[PDB]
Amino acid sequence: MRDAVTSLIKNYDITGRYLDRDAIDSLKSYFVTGTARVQAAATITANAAELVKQAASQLFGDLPELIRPGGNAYTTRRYAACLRDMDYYLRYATYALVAGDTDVLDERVLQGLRETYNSLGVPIGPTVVGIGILKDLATEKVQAAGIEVGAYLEQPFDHLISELSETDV
Amino acid sequence: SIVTKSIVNADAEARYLSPGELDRIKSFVTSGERRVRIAETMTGARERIIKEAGNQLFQKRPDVVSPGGNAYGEEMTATCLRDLDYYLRLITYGIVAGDVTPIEEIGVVGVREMYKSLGTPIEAVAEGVRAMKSVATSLLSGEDAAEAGAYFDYLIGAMS
Amino acid sequence: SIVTKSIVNADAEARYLSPGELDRIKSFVTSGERRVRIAETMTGARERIIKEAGNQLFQKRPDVVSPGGNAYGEEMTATCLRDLDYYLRLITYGIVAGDVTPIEEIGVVGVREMYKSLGTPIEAVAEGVRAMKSVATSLLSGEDAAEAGAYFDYLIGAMS
Amino acid sequence: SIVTKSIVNADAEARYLSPGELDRIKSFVTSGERRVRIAETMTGARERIIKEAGNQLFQKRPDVVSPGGNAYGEEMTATCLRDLDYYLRLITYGIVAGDVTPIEEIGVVGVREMYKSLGTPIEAVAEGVRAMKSVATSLLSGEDAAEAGAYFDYLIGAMS
Amino acid sequence: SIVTKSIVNADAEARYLSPGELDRIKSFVTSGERRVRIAETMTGARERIIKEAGNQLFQKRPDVVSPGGNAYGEEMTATCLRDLDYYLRLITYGIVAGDVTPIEEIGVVGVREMYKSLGTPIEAVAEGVRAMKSVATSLLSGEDAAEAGAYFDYLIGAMS
Amino acid sequence: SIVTKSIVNADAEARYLSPGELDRIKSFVTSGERRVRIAETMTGARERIIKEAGNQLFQKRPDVVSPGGNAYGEEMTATCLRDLDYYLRLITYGIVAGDVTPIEEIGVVGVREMYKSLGTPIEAVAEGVRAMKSVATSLLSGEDAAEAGAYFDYLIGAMS
Amino acid sequence: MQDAITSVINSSDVQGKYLDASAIQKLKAYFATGELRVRAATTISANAANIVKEAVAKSLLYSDITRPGGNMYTTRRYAACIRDLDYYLRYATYAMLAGDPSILDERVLNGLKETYNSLGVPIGATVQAIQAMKEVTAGLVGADAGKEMGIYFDYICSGLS
Amino acid sequence: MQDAITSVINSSDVQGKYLDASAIQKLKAYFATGELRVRAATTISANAANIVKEAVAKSLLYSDITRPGGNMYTTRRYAACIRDLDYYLRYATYAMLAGDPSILDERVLNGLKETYNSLGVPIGATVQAIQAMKEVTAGLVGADAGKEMGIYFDYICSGLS
Amino acid sequence: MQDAITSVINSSDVQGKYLDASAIQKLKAYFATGELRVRAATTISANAANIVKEAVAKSLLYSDITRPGGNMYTTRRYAACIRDLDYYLRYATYAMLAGDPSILDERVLNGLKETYNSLGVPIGATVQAIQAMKEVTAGLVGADAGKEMGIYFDYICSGLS
Amino acid sequence: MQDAITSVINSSDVQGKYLDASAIQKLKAYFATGELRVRAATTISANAANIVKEAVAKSLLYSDITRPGGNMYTTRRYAACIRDLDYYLRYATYAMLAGDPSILDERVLNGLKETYNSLGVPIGATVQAIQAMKEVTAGLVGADAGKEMGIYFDYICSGLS
Amino acid sequence: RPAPFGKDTRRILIHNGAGIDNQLSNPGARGNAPGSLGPKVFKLDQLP
Ligand SMILES: *[C@H](C)[C@H]1/C(=C/c2[nH]c(/C=C3N=C(/C=C4\NC(=O)C(CC)=C4C)C(C)=C\3CCC(=O)O)c(CCC(=O)O)c2C)NC(=O)[C@@H]1C
Ligand SMILES: *[C@H](C)[C@H]1/C(=C/c2[nH]c(/C=C3N=C(/C=C4\NC(=O)C(CC)=C4C)C(C)=C\3CCC(=O)O)c(CCC(=O)O)c2C)NC(=O)[C@@H]1C
Ligand SMILES: *[C@H](C)[C@H]1/C(=C/c2[nH]c(/C=C3N=C(/C=C4\NC(=O)C(CC)=C4C)C(C)=C\3CCC(=O)O)c(CCC(=O)O)c2C)NC(=O)[C@@H]1C
Ligand SMILES: *[C@H](C)[C@H]1/C(=C/c2[nH]c(/C=C3N=C(/C=C4\NC(=O)C(CC)=C4C)C(C)=C\3CCC(=O)O)c(CCC(=O)O)c2C)NC(=O)[C@@H]1C
Ligand SMILES: CCC1=C(C)/C(=C/C2=NC(=C\c3[nH]c(/C=C4\NC(=O)[C@H](C)[C@H]4CC)c(C)c3CCC(=O)O)/C(CCC(=O)O)=C2C)NC1=O
Ligand SMILES: CCC1=C(C)/C(=C/C2=NC(=C\c3[nH]c(/C=C4\NC(=O)[C@H](C)[C@H]4CC)c(C)c3CCC(=O)O)/C(CCC(=O)O)=C2C)NC1=O
Ligand SMILES: CCC1=C(C)/C(=C/C2=NC(=C\c3[nH]c(/C=C4\NC(=O)[C@H](C)[C@H]4CC)c(C)c3CCC(=O)O)/C(CCC(=O)O)=C2C)NC1=O
Ligand SMILES: CCC1=C(C)/C(=C/C2=NC(=C\c3[nH]c(/C=C4\NC(=O)[C@H](C)[C@H]4CC)c(C)c3CCC(=O)O)/C(CCC(=O)O)=C2C)NC1=O
Ligand SMILES: CCC1=C(C)/C(=C/C2=NC(=C\c3[nH]c(/C=C4\NC(=O)[C@H](C)[C@H]4CC)c(C)c3CCC(=O)O)/C(CCC(=O)O)=C2C)NC1=O
Questions:
Q1: Rounded-to-integer distance, Cα H94 and Cα D119, Å
Q2: Which DSSP symbol is given to H108?
Q3: Atom 6 of ligand 5: nearest residue by CA position
Q4: 3-state DSSP assignment of residue G52
Q5: Is E20 helix (H, G, I), strand (E, B) or coil?
Q6: Does residue J49's CB lie within 6 angstroms of at least one atom of ligand 6?
């Protein structure tokens, strides 16, 4: 949608300037990590259909308060819908990992997500834990794949946490 | 960019990132250091390109400069060099992005309605950017002038 | 944090941050490794604290456990241990932030409207924090007990 | 009283008191020889109402009689009948007043403060008051407790 | 109605309804049968009231029939008897609603500026309601004249 | 003007205009045929005023045009003579209004905060206006001395 | 603002005694003559803008006090002293229902002495107006309740002179 | 506001007619059950702080809104939710004596939808709470007035939805 | 806000020029009619309860907008409607006296078309009221000043419609 | 409102767990760069009346906008334009001291289309003033601190257009 | 149209009167009269 390149375009377009020395060195900082971005995005989709299955069984073994008849993950009508609604958070985290910033996450998944889940009774709470379990379970397959890891590939994920979850402090 | 265009196509089919667009993107990002030292030299010589293509346009189209044309007078022909200053400035955004969605969203999609509303001939700009291409291929080396010259050749197809 | 209440106290005066408060920020950032050592020793013994302070609360007030009052079985006594687990968690957040504003916006605004609806005594929660103060200050160092215990009294001023 | 509440309401409209309300004072004065039987019956059973409603309260909440609550001991259960007698020494001030204007200014206006300031939870205080106004309704007639029991049950929602 | 004073004067303190004000609700729904018989008889002879109290009003204040006054000619006195029928209808609303407020909102709060903009005397209609209450309390019973005559007395006492 | 604040003083009380200030409007509009005659004399010799008010200023405070001062330069005086030329435009607006609010809304309100920012001294621009006052009152006769010098006084006493 | 019902409530809680037998016949004296007061207080509201018709027209209307030079000669001083008489009637009728003059010295008699010596209001004209309006109410409520209304009317004139 | 009499009155006022016998029939039904509601309003105001405790533990406590992430996790934001339910118990008991949901309309439910949607407050948990609260008040007042109290609770959950 | 002198200053201020010979005759046309407008306002204010009386007598009285099935019917809504017609006349005195309709566009025409749909009062009767106010006024003041008062009447009617 | 510290301990509160080693590493990434910001926030606070002075002379002065017909012509408008610029330095130092542009979404990007459109403020001159202000600020504060400050200037003008 | 507003927000308002005399710039200037730009301030001096 809006790349880290194209975010730096309308960071410079609206002031009407060319590409100066700061433009030529911030953009080179994106390109030196681009080999590490793409190969991390391959191994995230190595077992991405397994990666949601290992996360949600580790979720629901951690919060039973979502299996026994309470909050909505009760039937397989809910549970297989939960695995799909989990799988969007894994799939859109692949895009913004390649795209540099989180503006793909900003206007594809985040907008309306506080208002979709409130209309259904889906809690926003364990969804943050569901991305928080996918926070480190994505870093394992990058680590076991030999990719270095760091803020890139561990950021898209907390931008799905710090902007989806409501501010307490 | 290409990286937006590879996501947005893969988002529409609602699959993951394919092995196809994993290698279009990886081949883009290992050419990323090559395109910025193309796009710096356009911005490093922006006062020469505008002056040379400004010298190259007005001898090709003397109906513009002559009175009763649109760019007539020293305030008006200073704006037509500013009118070409933007399109050189936009092309450097397209060389860095690897596509023309900086060109498309900023400098293409309403051009013919605007230039009809300003009085200028639309095809006279299409000669000028084509004259702007003929000084930009004399800057670069040969294997890069095919890459950066294609972004000039896209802008001709939007005008005419 | 200490950045936030050095801003919202400087925005009400509507001027810049004077260097009378910038040195306390400048001494805060260089003392970052000290507070993590306070926090990790605090959260590393979270079962040593509540199992000891839960007994010392019930010796100070045996009427929560005796038949008739609030907490019974291993369910309602256990959620009393959940709230002490919260306030042990909520007091290590202000230690790392260096300010009492993260314990403020979560738990120093309005519980005197809240706990009377729940039926728990408010002051018997406060005797649980003083047993939590004496356990953690005995575990922590001699100098930082005047710093970590400088947040423990702030919860006593909330309820009582 | 109901005379007092009507005239301060008519001062706010800056007019004379309305003929809708003048029915009520006229209804109050024909029931002024109806209210006085409720007042004298509480004289004859004030040693019977309080001594039964304490044990009705202590079987409902026996956290008080346990060692650690705010009335433990024979010197401390004196006030847990005396503060209950003090509330029985408030209804007969306002049975014959008709409404709650002696109920407020002696009983209600700061009662969230002082029971917190003495450590007694008001939810136990309102329970025995609710335990009091089941026995006083059974002692009075079915027509007496139809209106005075509605007047009895103000104080429980006013305290907690 | 009776609730409309009580549901507003207890909402403004943000409390529940005091049982002195629940006497006011109880105080009538026992009178709602007696309040409904009187307005059925008032409507049932509403032609005889206006044709009699309109008649001897002009024997008391003959100025408004006289030329130079407002109601010169039969085309304005029949327009004048509309306000007699309106105020007779507004009496019968206020007896059924139970108190002062529906006749106050519909026919009172602009009559010093309605009648001044019409140029009519504001005191002479106030003479007519005292004759409208003269013929009405002459035809109803004796026990309801202390009730239904007093709802007449408000729209006298705030007219002049 | 007088008329635009006699409206506002009569609008905020929601009244019509008193006839005392209707004399003030009526005496103002027959004075309009002579006040614009003052303003035509003032704009007819602006270049005789501004050149002379510059040379009466720069002899008095020679530090601002000597280098090291703010108005140093060939063109920097030409803005600073223009910055004093603006007050001759506004005084002719203040002459034809009979008032000082076109001086106020245009040339008073933030004039301390501009020259604090730009660096010119605030009294040094005020001494040009009293130097401009000495020549513009010498342009006119006796009866136009006080009527022009009163608005010259208000711009001096506000900036200083 | 408190009535005779709250006053015997006020004098019973403070000494530590309950609602005794001696407080009941103070209340039963209120409950006996309280039916008289609702017959009284309605008929004053029938004439509340008609007592002030008679208030000027008996002792103030065609007198030398209204003649230019006196105190009651201005339109800002006329209409300020009909409302200043109308308030003295309305707060009397509150005390007619209170059984107590303890609405008068909170809202009427608080600053009323010094505001008449300072504003040039003659005291003797008011007590010749207020005591004149005692007997016109005696023809409107009957014999006995006007003597009850004459207590609070004299409590005005004891608290004004 | 508006009241069930003052809606029957105002229906026959804008038509301009007098009191119709159907409207007179529409006022006797308010007066026949008026003695029931006046006893129903005291028994809720006695237990008004008690009902909210018995409601919030029926469907909100130990669940996923008073747990990390939900809107009642922050314990000085859960204190808003208790007095948010103090309003819907107070104003529904106002509307029971009014005979009319017009207390709830232009005072409570006029901008209630826009407040909750501008905060991320769960609508579907509020209707989960208020319909849970309706069972508790019907247990305390009896099944007679629980039909009457159940109407104005259902008016709250309808307009909020 | 601004008047005929302040606007022609502010028309000649933002150009940067002085007062030329193309703007002095805008002032000289104002100052020639300066004595005309002040006599026009002093007969408005002496008749201001009769211009609003004769305006509603041709449009609104004896119609069925003051019927019980009507907007005007309750006397709260009558006395507002005279007062909502008072504020159209009194500001029309002001703009004629200022010579510029800017005071109308700030306070009268602030949100007036969007309040009226939010209230439910008709707009098509209001243009019938002010155009009945226009024919009363021009007969009273004079056919000179009724022409310039007719502009600022219809400038409100241009804003309502 | 939050910073780099209170975004970490907000996002790690709401998962229910304590502060862990993945989030402490985010705090040490802020604590490694904290010493750079306090040197940066000190030097701007000593030159707040001078960064505004040069940047107005960089792009705004001697233009159409300074001249009559432009917007900042009247002295009253002019000072305001310094003042409506001076919030953009003070709030940008607060977000630089925070490490989060959460102040800038909250205090200084609310009405910033609708205030400036409803006051005649051109948007396109404010964006040109701000990167004229960013160039003199990054020259004053250094190359390393200039790009951290350069995020929060380009956060403002991207949200402002 | 709802909008998710923060925990603490400041609506930006325009001073009805002088432009610089907003209270967000100088809090020690809010006690001043607004002058000719703002509305008319009333005060009570002469008591009869
Ligand atoms: C194995 C012999 C037995 C068994 C074990 C089992 N099941 C699960 C997990 C789930 N079971 C369900 C069950 C249902 N969903 C429905 O809609 C219905 C019809 C009403 C039923 C019975 C669901 C939703 C799950 C997944 C969520 C969960 O964890 O409970 C497990 C856990 C698997 C894991 O560890 O991931 C186990 C061990 N299931 C059987 O059918 C046998 C009786
Ligand atoms: C499962 C781990 C969690 C959970 C999931 C859950 N979700 C739903 C329903 C929906 N989720 C979405 C979300 C999105 N749609 C999008 O387009 C995007 C951006 C790409 C997102 C994030 C939507 C729209 C729905 C509604 C159904 C639909 O998809 O059309 C349910 C179903 C609710 C039900 O009971 O019917 C569930 C169970 N709930 C949990 O408890 C877990 C935290
Ligand atoms: C224990 C030492 C004391 C005590 C505890 C107690 N609490 C509850 C119920 C609740 N407590 C809370 C409090 C918080 N929740 C939070 O998230 C935070 C901040 C992080 C605080 C302070 C809340 C919301 C509830 C209600 C639902 C819930 O449990 O979350 C109970 C149960 C009461 C009941 O009736 O169920 C108990 C026993 N009470 C005591 O007596 C001790 C003094
Ligand atoms: C509680 C069971 C539910 C809940 C409550 C909740 N509410 C808020 C915030 C507000 N609630 C109101 C309520 C009203 N405003 C009205 O005008 C009326 C009619 C009388 C009512 C009932 C308002 C104005 C606010 C917000 C203003 C403010 O800043 O406090 C919160 C706070 C939300 C937050 O994040 O701050 C909560 C938690 N939410 C639930 O989850 C329960 C379903
Ligand atoms: C709901 C409250 C309410 C009432 C009661 C009311 C009365 C009312 N009186 C009217 C006129 C009038 N009403 C009167 C009545 C009187 N003048 C007198 O001298 C006598 C005191 C009195 C009758 C005995 C007169 C004389 C007019 C005509 C005024 C005129 O012609 O100038 C009109 C306009 C004529 C019409 O519509 O037919 C109404 C609507 N309007 C209301 O909105
Ligand atoms: C009508 C309302 C109004 C005012 C008040 C106004 C003031 C004004 N004076 C200015 C400059 C200036 N003004 C001066 C003025 C002076 N130097 C001195 O030493 C003397 C004291 C003094 C004048 C006698 C100088 C030197 C500058 C240029 C400042 C600079 O370039 O640094 C500028 C900036 C240049 C421009 O934008 O054109 C403005 C806006 N303009 C207006 O439209
Ligand atoms: C609710 C209790 C209450 C009372 C009774 C009361 C009286 C009262 N009477 C006043 C004045 C006045 N009172 C009078 C009184 C009279 N004129 C006469 O001819 C007779 C002597 C007397 C007949 C009643 C006059 C003339 C003034 C105004 C003084 C003046 O003309 O300047 C004022 C001064 C303010 C004013 O009206 O201008 C008060 C406060 N205020 C209260 O709050
Ligand atoms: C100059 C600045 C200014 C304006 C714009 C102003 C407007 C104004 N006119 C109003 C009402 C009103 N406007 C009318 C309209 C009319 N009267 C009629 O009967 C006709 C149908 C129609 C005109 C011919 C009515 C009937 C109301 C009262 C509405 C109501 O009370 O429900 C209201 C609502 C006030 C209220 O009802 O409480 C406002 C604010 N007041 C002001 O000071
Ligand atoms: C941070 C919260 C905040 C906001 C958003 C804010 C905006 C703001 N900008 C304003 C004015 C203004 N602002 C300017 C603007 C400028 N000068 C220029 O030349 C440039 C084109 C531009 C900005 C660089 C002008 C030209 C006015 C109008 C002052 C007036 O007419 O009263 C005003 C009106 C002045 C007043 O308060 O009366 C406000 C409120 N003030 C605040 O406290």
A1: 34
A2: I
A3: E83
A4: helix
A5: coil
A6: no
CB contact under 8 A, E31 and D24: no
Question: Which of H71, H117, H128 has the most ligand 4 atoms within 8 A of CB, as the residue to mutate?
Answer: H71
Q: How many residues does chain D have?
A: 160
Answer for the pair E122, I58: CB distance below 8 angstroms, yes or no.
no
What's the CA gap between F138 and A66, in Å, rounded? 93
Determine contact, residues J20/J12, Cβ cutoff 8 Å.
yes
Closest residue by Cα to residue I129 from I60, I27, I32: I60
Buried b (16+ CB within 10 A) or exposed e, H43-62: bbbbbbbbbbbbbbeebbbe
Q: Which residues of chain K make contact with C14, given a CB cutoff of 8 A?
A: 24-27
The method recorded for this entry reads: cryo-EM
Closest C-alpha residue for ligand 7 atom 41:
G84
For helices F46-58 and F122-139, what crossing angle results, to 10°? 130
| Chain H residues with CB-CB distance to A168 below 8 A | 73-74, 77
Q: Locate tokens 């001696």: which residue? A: G22
Taking an 8 Å cut-off on Cβ atoms, the answer to whether J53 and F105 are in contact is no
**J81 C-alpha to ligand 9 centroid (Å):** 6
Residues with Cβ within 8 Å of J91's Cβ and at least 6 positions away in sequence, in order, are: J103, J104, J107, J108
Q: How many residues does chain K have?
A: 48
A126 touches chain H (CB under 8 A): yes
Q: Where are the alpha helices (DSSP H) in H99-142?
A: 102-103, 112-117, 123-141
CA atoms within 13 A on the CB side of H25: 3
| Residue I91 · residue I104 · CB < 8 Å | yes
Q: Which of A98, A108, A109, A141 to mutate to test the interface with B (most CBs of B within 10 A)?
A: A98
Report the candidate in A87, A74, F160, H10 with the shortest Cα–Cα distance to residue E103: H10
Assess whether the C-beta atom of G84 lies below 6 angstroms from ligand 7: yes
C117: chain H residues, CB-CB within 8 Å: 49, 52-53, 56, 82
**Cα C42 vs. chain centroid, distance in angstroms?**
11
CB C25 within 8 A of CB J98: no
Q: Which two tokens stand for residue E136?
A: 């009405």
Residue closest to J76 by CA, chosen among F124, F114, F120, I17:
F114
Cβ under 8 Å to C: H residues 3-62: 49, 52-53, 56
Token code pair at residue C77: 């006594």
Question: What does the buried/exposed string (b/e) look like for B61-80 if buried means 16 or more CB atoms within 10 Å of the residue's CB?
Answer: beebbeeebbbeeeeebeeb
Chains that touch C (3 or more CB pairs under 8 A): A, D, H, J, K
Question: Cβ of K4 and H114 within 8 Å?
Answer: no
User: Exposed, middle or buried by CB within 10 Å (0-12, 13-18, 19+), for A101?
Assistant: buried
Q: Does J119 touch chain F (CB under 8 A)?
A: no
Q: Nearest Cβ partner of J106 from K6, K20, K24?
A: K6
Q: Do chains K and F touch (3 or more CB pairs under 8 A)?
A: yes
Angle at the Cα of D42 (from D41 to D46), degrees rounded to 5?
A: 130
- CA D150 – CA D152 distance, rounded (Å): 5
Kindly calculate the radius of gyration of chain I based on its CA atoms and give it in whole angstroms.
18
Query: Which residues, 6+ apart, have CB-to-CB distance to F151 below 8 Å?
Result: F91, F94, F95, F100, F103
Supply angle C-alpha J37, J41, J42, rounded to 5.
120
Phi/psi of residue D129, nearest 5 degrees: -65, -40
Q: Relative to the alpha carbon of F118, which ligand is closest?
A: 6
Radius of gyration of chain A (CA): 18
**Distance from chain centroid for Cα A126:** 15
Best CA proximity match to C82, nearest among C96, C71, C97: C71
Start-to-end CA span in chain F (Å): 24
Residue F89 burial (CB count, 10 A)? 22
Q: What type of residue is E19?
A: P
